[PDB]
Each structure stands twice: as C-alpha cells, then as structure tokens.
Write a protein that binds this ligand. Structure first.
Ligand SMILES: O=C(O)CCN1C(=O)/C(=C2/C(=O)N(Cc3c(Cl)cccc3Cl)c3ccc(Cl)cc32)SC1=S
Length: 439
C-alpha cells in the first residue's frame, strides 16, 4: 500500500519550509518583486542552481495581470495560500489498489483539497525516493515550443482562478465533501459471454448534440476520457478532453495524489462533488482560460457539484484491429463497468471517447458505448463536437436500431470487417445500408 509523501514527511526540509510559509503568511517577509517569489520557491523546492526559465511560464501569467492584481498576487495571494499549506495535518496520502470487487474511497473537505492544490502551486509535492513529483514545476518551466508555453500558461490561469475562489469559500462550502473512488469491478466478461448477456438487452435512448460539451449536462454521469494514469498530461503538456476538465475543475488534481497506479482493465474511477471554476474556449493549442461569467448557466456550473466517471480507452496504433473480439470485449467491459456505476444517475454524458490521440474509430466507439449504456439500463447523450457528418450518421443508426436487440446489434457490428461493405463504407454507413435494406 503506497503512500504519497506530503511535505511534513520530510521534517528536516519541513522545518525550513514551515519557517518560510508562516514567514509569508504573517506578513513578516514581504514580496516586493516576482524575483522574490522565485527565491521563495527555490527554497521550498530545496534547489541549488536556479535559472530564469524554471518559472518562465508563471512569470508570463504574472505579467499579464494589471498592476493592481500583480500587487495583490505578491502581497496577498501567495501569503494566503502559504496559510492553506500550513493548515495541512496529514503527512502522506494513501494510494490503495482495491481488492477484487472492492472500492478504495478517499474523501476530503472542499477546503482540504485547496490545501493540496496550494502545495502543487508552490512546487512542494515530490517523492524523492521515487524521483516523482506531483506539482506545477514542469508547467512553470520554459519549453522550446511557444505553443506549449501557452498551454502551460493557460493551465496556470485556471489553477490561479480556482485558488482565488477557494480563499473566498463560505464556511458552508469549505465543509462540503469531495469524494474520489478507485473501483474494482470484478470478473471481466469475454466476447461470447457478452453476446449471451446481450440477448436479454434492448438498445436504449441516445441524444445527439452538435454544439454542447459534456459538462453542459449537469445531473448526468459525466465521462472523462481518461488516461490509465488519471490526469494524463495535466501536469505537463496535455490539454485535450481529460486535461481540460482538470483545468476547469481543479479539485480533480487530488486524484493524482491517491491514484498513483495505472487503472487495471477492470478498474474505473469516480469523482463526486466536483465543481467548475473556470470557463474556457478552444482545445489543445487553441485552449484559453476564460473567467466565468454571471449568467444562470455559469452560476450553476460554479455552485452545482457534479459526478464524473473516468474510464480509459485503449491506446491503439494504426495497424491494430479495433474490431477484434479481444479489443471489443475489452472496451465493452471498461465502458459498462464504468456506466453501471452510480445507478441513480440514469443518463450518461459522453462523446468521442478515445478517438483523438488514442486513434479510436468513433463509429465503433459509439456502438460499444451504446451497447454498454443499454445493458446498463441508462440513457446516453453523445457530444459530437461539431462533427456534422458523424452527427447525421449516428442519428440515422439510432433511428434504425433503437429498441432493437443489442446482441443482434453487436454481431452485426462485428461482421463489418469481414463483410463486403468493408471497402467503401464506414461502420456507421454499413449499419445504415443494412437498416434501410429492410425495405
Ligand atoms: O479522447 C480525447 O481526449 C478526445 C475526444 N475528442 C474531443 O474531445 C474533441 C474535442 C474537440 O474537437 N473540440 C473542439 C470543439 C469545441 Cl472547443 C467546441 C465545439 C466543438 C468542437 Cl469540435 C473539443 C473541445 C472541448 C473538448 Cl473538452 C473536446 C473537444 S475531438 C475528439 S476526437
């Protein structure tokens, strides 16, 4: 049972750190410049050396602030977050791999979570014996590629926005519980086993949306298209679906602190009580932090906690056969083991799961999720992210196969690769051709 070392674990260094924290917390030490901050950090990281690039991205965010907020940042914000670190009572966090069919759950107060994100902000979360860190140091660090520095800078804005809001927490809000769950789901079923089990199952409802994002659907089981290492490149260069979600909902960062080990094929992660703190536009290189507004919808995102299912798709290469009975049954397991969780959340909010850098064919990832949600006895919302052609296709397929038998459906899908249509039909087109052929 692995335990992630909090700063106090190293009492030697903790002496120095603590000294410096209350030093700033009190107003004893006052920061006049960003240069001052940098030496603060170098101390807290216990680092001999020091060049300017180490904090190039942090600096860049700092300098985009107005003179008033730069003042605020150095005189008020940093000291206040040092105080949050000082409120920490734990010296390590537990990373347990649940036994078969059991759950490792870890719960925190909303404020406690802010204490830990503060540690990440001040680059003091590391396991020296493993030479593993879990804070913002790479993000702060200058990269050779400007786009990458922008992504880092943008992530920094999100975490800062979040931190500012964590300081203004009402007594009530700071006590609310956030919950992380590593869930072992037991025996993996194989292809034949699946085909059998689905004979009893009918395809359930699916809704398409061109222009909405997953988090626009509060009160659903919201999917994070996760890496097997939860968080993916959140602490580095990553800025696609999973990392973006961590960016706008930074409480998720703590999952990094308890779920060190890769998810196993029969594992899923659930995060409850997660609120959204930033808005954004774009994706990857175009991703930009956008301060959250005042509208009805914005107030809700900020104040209404959501529940999130993190499941990791297979990472394919270009030669892999995604339609193999082994690969399919694997994705059926993962999604269904995930979707069947939180049975009071009867709608799954999902989308192009594993179809980006993971090279998944979306037509098939759709079919698998539909089968999984159906078996789960849940409705599904699919976000196609402005893919007009796919939207049209999936709609048609839904109209042809809703309420139809899921086992017949699966077999239909599994024959595509062999079928005649394999050459100049996509999977969805092939399904349409066979759905229209019935007349
Ligand atoms: O498995 C994955 O990490 C990626 C799944 N995937 C997306 O999430 C895609 C997005 C996308 O094209 N876009 C751009 C986009 C936006 Cl911002 C708004 C409306 C439509 C689109 Cl396409 C995304 C924007 C936000 C989020 Cl969270 C995801 C996407 S494309 C794709 S494949």
């Amino acid at each position: 049972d692995y335990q992630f070392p909090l700063p106090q674990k190293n009492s030697e260094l903790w002496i120095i750190q603590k000294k410096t924290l209350q030093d700033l917390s009190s107003g004893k030490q006052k920061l006049d410049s960003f240069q001052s901050l940098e030496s603060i950090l170098e101390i807290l990281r216990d680092s001999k050396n020091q060049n300017d690039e180490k904090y190039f991205n942090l600096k860049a965010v700092f300098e985009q602030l107005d003179k008033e907020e730069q003042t605020y940042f150095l005189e008020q914000f940093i000291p206040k977050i040092c105080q949050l670190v000082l409120k920490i009572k734990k010296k390590q966090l537990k990373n347990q791999i649940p036994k078969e069919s059991k759950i490792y759950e870890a719960a925190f107060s909303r404020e406690e979570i802010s204490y830990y994100v503060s540690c990440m902000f001040l680059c003091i979360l590391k396991d020296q014996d493993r030479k593993i860190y879990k804070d913002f140091r790479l993000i702060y660090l200058k990269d050779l590629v400007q786009q990458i520095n922008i992504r880092r800078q943008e992530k920094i804005k999100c975490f800062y926005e979040y931190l500012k809001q964590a300081l203004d927490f009402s007594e009530k809000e700071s006590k609310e519980v956030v919950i992380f769950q590593r869930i072992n789901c037991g025996q993996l079923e194989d292809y034949e086993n699946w085909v059998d089990k689905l004979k009893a199952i009918k395809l359930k409802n699916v809704q398409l949306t061109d222009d909405k994002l997953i988090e626009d659907f509060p009160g659903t089981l919201q999917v994070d298209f996760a890496n097997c290492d939860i968080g993916g490149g959140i602490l580095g260069n990553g800025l696609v679906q999973e990392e973006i979600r961590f960016c706008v909902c930074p409480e998720m960062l703590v999952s990094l602190l308890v779920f060190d080990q890769s998810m196993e094929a029969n594992e899923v992660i659930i995060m409850k009580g997660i609120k959204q703190y930033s808005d954004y536009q774009g994706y990857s290189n175009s991703f930009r932090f956008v301060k959250m507004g005042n509208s009805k919808i914005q107030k809700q995102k900020r104040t209404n906690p959501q529940t999130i299912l993190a499941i990791d798709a297979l990472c394919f290469n270009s030669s892999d056969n995604q339609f193999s009975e082994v690969n399919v049954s694997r994705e059926l397991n993962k999604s269904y083991m995930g979707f069947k969780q939180e049975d009071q959340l009867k709608t799954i909010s999902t989308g192009k799961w594993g179809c980006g850098a993971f090279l998944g064919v979306f037509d098939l990832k759709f079919a698998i999720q539909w089968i999984a949600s159906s078996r789960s006895n849940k409705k599904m919302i699919i976000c196609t992210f402005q893919d007009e052609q796919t939207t049209k296709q999936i709609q048609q397929v839904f109209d042809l196969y809703k309420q139809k038998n899921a086992s017949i459906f699966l077999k239909l899908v599994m024959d595509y690769p062999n079928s005649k249509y394999m050459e100049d039909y996509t999977l969805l087109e092939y399904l349409i051709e066979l759905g229209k052929e019935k007349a």
